[PDB]
């Protein structure tokens, strides 16, 4: 359910993710590095399962940030894919892919892979 | 089929992978980049399923190259995980993970991921 995902979240490296879950399955918000303030803020868009299996199954979700705002352009996009697990300590566990724009010859080393855990702090 | 893995294979960027498959599941050989020269070569070791399923399934396999030989040390290691498919046009379809040795500050950007298709052509 949307209410659970909506809020401010932080990962282990100190980045900020602010997200609103809409009732049609949409995710919208902003993503920031730990330096804080204005420009490290980038737009995110994503989708989540708005009718999850009951059980103690997580809610699957995913979102994308393209690393261009009005102050910087890193010519790259990251997608996070994972699941929301609710409880006292709500968490989002993800794996992510970072692709950079490259020339044809360097395309084989264009994509980084890694994983992030987000802890919630506010709605 | 099983030992059809033993041979010389090429990925889509011209790198060459020469492997011996042991009867009990060992994979041993060398990998070298295109450019050709006799040390762009690195040693590899791996494992494969030596008794695959009898329905039309591929044979699962994987191997590792640490990128150090007597000439270069790129302080990294790549692992390829995939499956061999026999037939008139045999191939090995893989995905790989390249990790570099980094400091803790750069650990989040230590690993690249990609995919390779090896054929005998």
């Amino acid at each position: 359910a949307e209410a659970g995902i909506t809020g401010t979240w932080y990962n282990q490296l100190g980045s900020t993710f602010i997200v609103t879950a809409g009732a049609d399955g949409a995710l919208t918000g902003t993503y920031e590095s730990a330096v804080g303030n204005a420009e490290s803020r980038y737009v995110l868009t994503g989708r989540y399962d708005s009718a999850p299996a009951t059980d103690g199954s997580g809610t699957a979700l995913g979102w994308t940030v393209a690393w261009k705002n009005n102050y910087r352009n890193a010519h790259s996009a990251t997608t996070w894919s994972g699941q929301y697990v609710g409880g006292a300590e709500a968490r989002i566990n993800t794996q992510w892919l970072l692709t950079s724009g490259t020339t044809e010859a360097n395309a084989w080393k264009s994509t980084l892979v890694g994983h992030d855990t987000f802890t919630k702090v506010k709605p | 089929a099983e030992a059809g893995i033993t041979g010389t294979w090429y990925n889509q960027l011209g790198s060459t992978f020469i492997v011996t498959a042991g009867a009990d599941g060992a994979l041993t050989g060398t990998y070298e980049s295109a450019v050709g020269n006799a040390e762009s070569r690195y040693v590899l070791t791996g494992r494969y399923d030596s008794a695959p399923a009898t329905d039309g399934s591929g044979t699962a396999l994987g191997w590792t190259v640490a990128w150090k030989n007597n000439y270069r040390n790129a302080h990294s290691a790549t692992t390829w995980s995939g499956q061999y498919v026999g037939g008139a046009e045999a191939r090995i379809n893989t995905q790989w993970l390249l990790t570099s040795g980094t400091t803790e500050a750069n650990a989040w950007k230590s690993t690249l991921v990609g995919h390779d298709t090896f054929t005998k052509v």
Partner: peptide, 6 residues
């Protein structure tokens, strides 16, 4: 440096 992390 990439903006994804610090």
């Amino acid at each position: 440096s990439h903006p994804q992390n610090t």
